[PDB]
Design a protein around this ligand. Structure first.
Ligand SMILES: NC(=O)c1ccc[n+]([C@@H]2O[C@H](COP(=O)([O-])OP(=O)([O-])OC[C@H]3O[C@@H](n4cnc5c(N)[nH+]cnc54)[C@H](O)[C@@H]3O)[C@@H](O)[C@H]2O)c1
Ligand SMILES: NC(=O)c1ccc[n+]([C@@H]2O[C@H](COP(=O)([O-])OP(=O)([O-])OC[C@H]3O[C@@H](n4cnc5c(N)[nH+]cnc54)[C@H](O)[C@@H]3O)[C@@H](O)[C@H]2O)c1
Ligand SMILES: [Zn+2]
Ligand SMILES: [Zn+2]
Ligand SMILES: [Zn+2]
Ligand SMILES: [Zn+2]
Lengths: 374, 374
C-alpha cells in the first residue's frame, strides 16, 4: 500500500538544457492538504515539453516535464473533494481555482494560479514533492507527467469518465483541446469561412479539426514539411502550401488565394516571423488571427500597427481558451460520444522508457503525437 | 447658377510639409458621373489633418486636406441617386461602396475603395477636380473639406437630416464617431467594466463618452497634458493620470489601480510606445485593447507576443468600425434626439480664413476641436 508513504518510482528527469532525459528512480512525497497523487497511465509528447529541453520555454531545472497526460488517483490529501482514489483524471497545466478574477470571468481561462507566466516549478505551496539522488527536482506547470507518479494541486486535476481510454484522452490534457478550442472558442470560426493554419503538428491538426467542426468552407494548411500535408487533408484541410515552394512571401500567396485575405488565421508553430505573417494574411478589415505557438523566451516581434488599425483582430490563448476543470470532463464525454476523433493525432505509441526516442521522432519531423505508456 | 461650370473658390492648399496652409483661389471642376459637388458649411480640425502637415500620415502633396465636415450639395453628376442639390451632407473619409467584400461583411467597415491604406490623393477615377495656379492639387481621403467647394465620389457622401446644425454635426464625420464607435462597437465595452483611455483629445473624449454610454464603472483617462483632465471628467472619466507624475511605467500603475489590469484600453494618441503600453495594461487573460491613433508612417512597433498568448485581444479600427454611409445619418438623427452631446468637444470656433490659427491652437495643446465656418 502506498497512501501516506513516499513512493520510489521511475521518472524522466531533465538535469540541464539540451540533454536527453534521464530515466531513473525518484522519490514522490505523499500529497499534503488539497493535493492529489496520481499513477500515470499515458502521456503525450507536446512540442512545449521540447521547448523546455531547447531553452525556448524557460522553467527552473532540474525538472520533471510532461503536461499532456492521464492517470488514476492513488491518494488524496486532507480536504480534497473533487477526486477520490481510483478515479481517472487528467492533470490541468492551466489550473482552475474558481476564485480569481479570471476564473470568475465568462471568457477568461488563464487562472492566476498558473505556473506559466512566471514559472517557479513548484506546488502551489512553493515546495516540491520530488527528489532524485538526494536533490529536489522542480515541477512543470503544476503537472510533471513524465513520471510513474506525480502530485498535483486539486485545482490542477479533473476527474473524467471511469470508462475513458487513457491512452487516447491524454491528448485532451493539451494538444487536442488547445487546437480545437483555438478554432471554436477563441477565433469563433464561422460557417463558410476561409481559414489558414500555420503548423501542421498535433496542435495545428486539432485547429483544422475545429475549423472543420465550425463549418469552414476552406482550410489552408501551411507547413515547410510537406510530409505533414496528407494527414492535414485527412482531418479537413482543403489545400496545403509550403512557403519554400514560392518566390513570394506566403502572406501574399495566401492573400491572393483567398481573394483579399483569410477570415481566420492561426499561428501554431512558435516563430515570431510566422506570427506576423499569420496576422498579415487575414483580411485587413475583419480578419482574426490567433497565436497558439509558444514564442522563444524574451524575444519581441516587429510589426506595423496599420495591420491592426484597418480592422484586424489579433489574440492569443492558452489551452484553447477552455476553463480547464469545467471543460476537460466535458471534452472527454464528447470524445466518448464520438463528437471528435483523437486517433488521427497519434502516430506512435511507445513505452515510457523510450521517451528520448519519442522526442527524436518529434524533432526529426516524423511524428505528430507519440503517446508514452507507463 | 453654377451647375456644370468650374467654380473658383478659396481653399487651404498645403504646398509643403511643415508649412502653414495657403488660403488662396482654386478651380473646382464640376462633378463627373457618380460625383457630388458640395458647398462646405463647417469643418473640424482633426489631428489626422495635422499629421498630413507633419508627415506623420503620408499622402501626396500638394493637397487640400480636411475630412471632418458638413455641407450642402451644390450639384450632382450623372447617375447620382443618393443625394440631391440642396441636401445637407457629411463627406465620408471611409467610403461605403456597398459592393466589396468588406462592405458586404457584417462587421467590416474599411471599404476597399478607401484612399487611406495606400494614399493616391485622387478621386475614384484616379484624377483630380482641383487646380491652383494652373497646377493640379491632390485630394485627401476622397473628401478634401478645407475648401469652400469640394467634389467627392457618391460612395464618399451621406445625406443627413435637413434640420441638422452643420456647425455641430461635422464632428460625426470623424472624431465623435471614431471615438464613440471604438468603445461601443469595436471594443464592445460592458456594463460595470474598467476602461483606460490614452489621449484626451477630441477622439479620446469621444471614447470616454462611449465607455460611459456602455455603462463602464471606471474610466481612467491618461494624458501627459493635465489641462485635458477637467473636460475628460466632465464627459465621464472617473479619474485621470499623467504618466509624467509616476516613477513606474504607466502600464504598471494602471494594472495596480485596476487590481490586475483593465477590461478595455484604447490608444488614442498615435505613438508606438503607447500602443504597447495600452495593450499591456489590459488584463492578460481577457483584456481588450483598441488602437485608434494613427501611427507614424512606415514605422514598426516591437512587442512580446506573450502579451497575446495569455489571452489578450488587440485590434484597431478606422472610423469607430462604423459602416460610414449607413451609420452617419443615424448618428445625426441620434444627435438631434439628444442621445449624445457634441458641444463638449468644441472648444473654439473660427472662420475658415483663420485655419492656421486653428492648427496653432491644436499644436499648443489648448484646443479639443476648433470648428471652422465657411
Ligand atoms: N497555447 C497553448 O496552450 C499551446 C498548447 C500546446 C502547444 N503550444 C505550442 O504550439 C506549437 C505547436 O505545437 P505542436 O503542434 O506540438 O508542435 P509540432 O508538432 O512541432 O508542429 C509544429 C509544425 O510547425 C511546422 N513548422 C516549423 N517551422 C515552420 C515554418 N517556418 N513555417 C511553417 N511551418 C513550420 C513544423 O514542420 C511542424 O509540423 C508549439 O510552439 C507549442 O509550444 C501552445
Ligand atoms: N482611427 C481613426 O479612424 C482615427 C480617427 C480620428 C483620429 N485618429 C487619430 O487619433 C489620434 C487622436 O486624434 P485627436 O483626438 O484628434 O488628437 P489630439 O487632440 O492631438 O489628442 C491626442 C492627445 O494625446 C495626448 N498625448 C500626446 N502624447 C501622449 C503620451 N505620451 N501619453 C499620453 N497622452 C499623450 C495629447 O496631450 C492630446 O491630448 C491621432 O493620432 C489621430 O490621427 C484616428
Ligand atoms: Zn483562478
Ligand atoms: Zn502542450
Ligand atoms: Zn466597399
Ligand atoms: Zn480624423
Amino acid at each position: 500500500s502506498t497512501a501516506g508513504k513516499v513512493i520510489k518510482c521511475k521518472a524522466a528527469v531533465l538535469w540541464e538544457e539540451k540533454k536527453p532525459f534521464s530515466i531513473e528512480e525518484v522519490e514522490v512525497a505523499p500529497p499534503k492538504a488539497h493535493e492529489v497523487r496520481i499513477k500515470m497511465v499515458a502521456t503525450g509528447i507536446c512540442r512545449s515539453d521540447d521547448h523546455v529541453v531547447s531553452g525556448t520555454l524557460v522553467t527552473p531545472l532540474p525538472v520533471i516535464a510532461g503536461h499532456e497526460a492521464a492517470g488514476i488517483v492513488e491518494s488524496i490529501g486532507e480536504g480534497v473533494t473533487t477526486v477520490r482514489p481510483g478515479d481517472k483524471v487528467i492533470p490541468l497545466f492551466t489550473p482552475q481555482c474558481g476564485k480569481c478574477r479570471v476564473c470568475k470571468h465568462p471568457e477568461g481561462n488563464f487562472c492566476l494560479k498558473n505556473d506559466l507566466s512566471m514559472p517557479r516549478g513548484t506546488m502551489q505551496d512553493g515546495t516540491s514533492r520530488f527528489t532524485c539522488r538526494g536533490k529536489p527536482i522542480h515541477h512543470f506547470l503544476g503537472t510533471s507527467t513524465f513520471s510513474q507518479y506525480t502530485v498535483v494541486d486539486e485545482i490542477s486535476v479533473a476527474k473524467i469518465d471511469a470508462a475513458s481510454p487513457l491512452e487516447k484522452v491524454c491528448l485532451i490534457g493539451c494538444g487536442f483541446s488547445t487546437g480545437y478550442g483555438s478554432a471554436v472558442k477563441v477565433a469563433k470560426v464561422t460557417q463558410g469561412s476561409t481559414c489558414a493554419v500555420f503548423g501542421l503538428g498535433g496542435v495545428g491538426l486539432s485547429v483544422i479539426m475545429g475549423c472543420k467542426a465550425a463549418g469552414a468552407a476552406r482550410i489552408i494548411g501551411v507547413d515547410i514539411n510537406k510530409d505533414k500535408f496528407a494527414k492535414a487533408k485527412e482531418v479537413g484541410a482543403t489545400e496545403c502550401v509550403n512557403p519554400q515552394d514560392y518566390k513570394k512571401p506566403i502572406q501574399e500567396v495566401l492573400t491572393e488565394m483567398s481573394n483579399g485575405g483569410v477570415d481566420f488565421s492561426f499561428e501554431v508553430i512558435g516563430r515570431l516571423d510566422t506570427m506576423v505573417t499569420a496576422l498579415s494574411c487575414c483580411q485587413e478589415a475583419y480578419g482574426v488571427s490567433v497565436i497558439v505557438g509558444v514564442p522563444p523566451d524574451s524575444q519581441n516581434l516587429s510589426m506595423n500597427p496599420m495591420l491592426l488599425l484597418s480592422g484586424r483582430t489579433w489574440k492569443g490563448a492558452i489551452f484553447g481558451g477552455f476553463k480547464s476543470k469545467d471543460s476537460v470532463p466535458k471534452l472527454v464525454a464528447d470524445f466518448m460520444a464520438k463528437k471528435f476523433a483523437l486517433d488521427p493525432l497519434i502516430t506512435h505509441v511507445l513505452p515510457f522508457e523510450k521517451i528520448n526516442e519519442g522526442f527524436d521522432l518529434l524533432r526529426s519531423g516524423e511524428s505528430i503525437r507519440t503517446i508514452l505508456t507507463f
